[PDB]
Amino acid sequence: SPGIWQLDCTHLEGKVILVAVHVASGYIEAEVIPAETGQETAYFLLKLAGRWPVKTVHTDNGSNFTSTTVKAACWWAGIKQEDGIPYNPQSQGVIESMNKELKKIIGQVRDQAEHLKTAVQMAVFIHNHKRKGGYSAGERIVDIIATDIQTK
């Protein structure tokens, strides 16, 4: 699954945090937006796809799945837009745990940052660099993709 991502939208401080998770590694990208709209989601996906080789995005909700603006960005960037239905139920729990983790890190840094957007990027950094078990998510994503490029 080198190219499979899942969108996730969580809320803090009356603001919206939009997250893209690379499912196979746990690596994330995130941004703060005032509200989840098709236009914001579309722009976020265009940024993501310019940075990583995004084949498929599991959308976070039916509004973003339906959105013509999101569909246009997915067309532009060559992304297969999919639903995010948890046919495997462990998905909903894993995303929930990651949201809890991110909010925990935001709290741990929140006071080093005036603006939530700074705290969120600090949380992204800490999440992606954290060693588990021990590789980080940042190491895993690069390994997965590099192996894909060489295999094919």
Side-chain angles (χ1 to χ4, degrees), residues 25 101 125-140:
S25 65
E101 179 220 38
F125 182 110
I126 288 164
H127 173 88
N128 285 339
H129 282 82
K130 182 162 193 175
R131 298 191 168 291
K132 287 294 197 308
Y135 297 107
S136 70
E139 290 170 326
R140 294 187 294 259

Side-chain angles (χ1 to χ4, degrees), residues 6 8 21 84-102:
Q6 191 166 315
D8 159 47
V21 187
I85 297 165
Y87 292 109
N88 182 350
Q90 280 193 352
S91 300
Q92 72 200 71
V94 163
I95 295 300
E96 277 295 301
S97 289
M98 177 189 80
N99 290 340
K100 294 173 181 296
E101 179 220 38
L102 287 179

Side-chain angles (χ1 to χ4, degrees), residues 3 11 24-25 36 42 44 58-59 77 81 89 106 127 135 137 142 146 152:
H11 297 80
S25 65
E36 191 180 33
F44 182 72
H58 295 271
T59 60
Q81 186 210 42
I106 293 160
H127 173 88
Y135 297 107
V142 165
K152 301 173 186 170

Side-chain angles (χ1 to χ4, degrees), residues 114-130:
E114 174 163 52
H115 303 297
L116 179 61
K117 67 184 174 67
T118 296
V120 167
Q121 300 307 325
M122 286 176 169
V124 167
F125 182 110
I126 288 164
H127 173 88
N128 285 339
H129 282 82
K130 182 162 193 175

